[PDB]
Ligand binder design. Structure first.
Ligand SMILES: N#Cc1ccccc1O
Length: 282
């Protein structure tokens, strides 16, 4: 079925919490023993969101190598993502240790710091060129280089060094800042437009490590961007274009990290995105 015609029967037919619920239950439920250790209890932002043991990104340190993050491998498409939670006041050093270690080129941030009146993460990047940040624990220095503020998003170029060692990698931060507090945007053109910006950066490509992607829990909004991204990929590459099924793809991503796409408002939005992006894919 050509998604567009089933977007119709579904929206015509009044049923998303219908299909959302069908996705939920059929999803995978793996083990996450590392994340519940007592010793790791402050490192988690939420009680119900943790990384599965099998797909977790492991920090290369003698002490504690736990971070609440997960590696998402989409095989056919040939894309891997690092999904995660918004860093916490105390896990900011671990956040940047894992960008260093996995060799990523990009962080894609889909929320703001204070959303709905609360803090959804620590402000983990420098606000000024002149006042750099040092993560004494992980022995890393971070410095803002340049910074472009647009209407719908903000782009930043930063430098990550190993204090301990003298290596410098440049990092690009794509920040989505105009996602309303409640729901999902009324059009997907802005979202598609930011995605593409990220695709142009080198930030999602094979000669690099996987991009780190995050919101406040790392599941809802992050699941959306990724899902759109992987799907456009597949239509792009197949001999067979409406032979791309969002749901089966979503369920595959879901093999790696729990609860991606938190609401039915966001599934549906997912489908729009995708369809609208599949007119360029010309
Ligand atoms: N890409 C991709 C993908 C989606 C669903 C099932 C298997 C795959 O390799």
């Amino acid at each position: 079925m050509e998604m567009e015609k089933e977007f119709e029967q579904i929206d015509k037919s009044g049923s998303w919490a219908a299909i959302y619920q069908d996705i939920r239950h059929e999803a995978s439920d793996f083990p996450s023993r590392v994340a519940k250790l007592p010793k790791n209890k402050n490192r988690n932002r939420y009680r119900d969101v943790s990384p599965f043991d099998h797909s977790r990104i492991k920090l290369h340190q003698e002490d504690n190598d736990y971070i609440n993050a997960s590696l998402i491998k989409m095989e056919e498409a040939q894309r891997s993502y690092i999904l995660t939670q918004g860093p916490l006041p105390n896990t900011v050093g671990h956040f940047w240790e894992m960008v260093w270690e996995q060799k990523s080129r990009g962080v894609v941030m889909l929320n703001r710091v204070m959303e709905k009146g609360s803090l959804k993460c620590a402000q983990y990047w420098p606000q000024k060129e002149e006042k750099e940040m040092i993560f004494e624990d992980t022995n890393l220095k971070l410095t803002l280089i340049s910074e472009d503020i647009k209407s719908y998003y903000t782009v930043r170029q930063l430098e990550l060094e190993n204090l301990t060692t003298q290596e410098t990698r440049e990092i690009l931060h794509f920040h989505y800042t105009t996602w309303p507090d409640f729901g999902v945007p009324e059009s997907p053109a802005s979202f598609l437009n930011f995605l593409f910006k990220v695709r142009e950066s080198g930030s999602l490509s094979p000669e690099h490590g996987p991009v780190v992607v995050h919101c406040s829990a790392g599941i809802g909004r992050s699941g959306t961007f990724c899902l759109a991204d992987t799907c456009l990929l597949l239509m792009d590459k197949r001999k067979d274009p409406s032979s791309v099924d969002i749901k089966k793809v979503l369920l595959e991503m879901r093999k790696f990290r729990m609860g991606l796409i938190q609401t039915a408002d966001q599934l549906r939005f997912s489908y729009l995105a995708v369809i609208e992006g599949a007119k360029f894919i010309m």
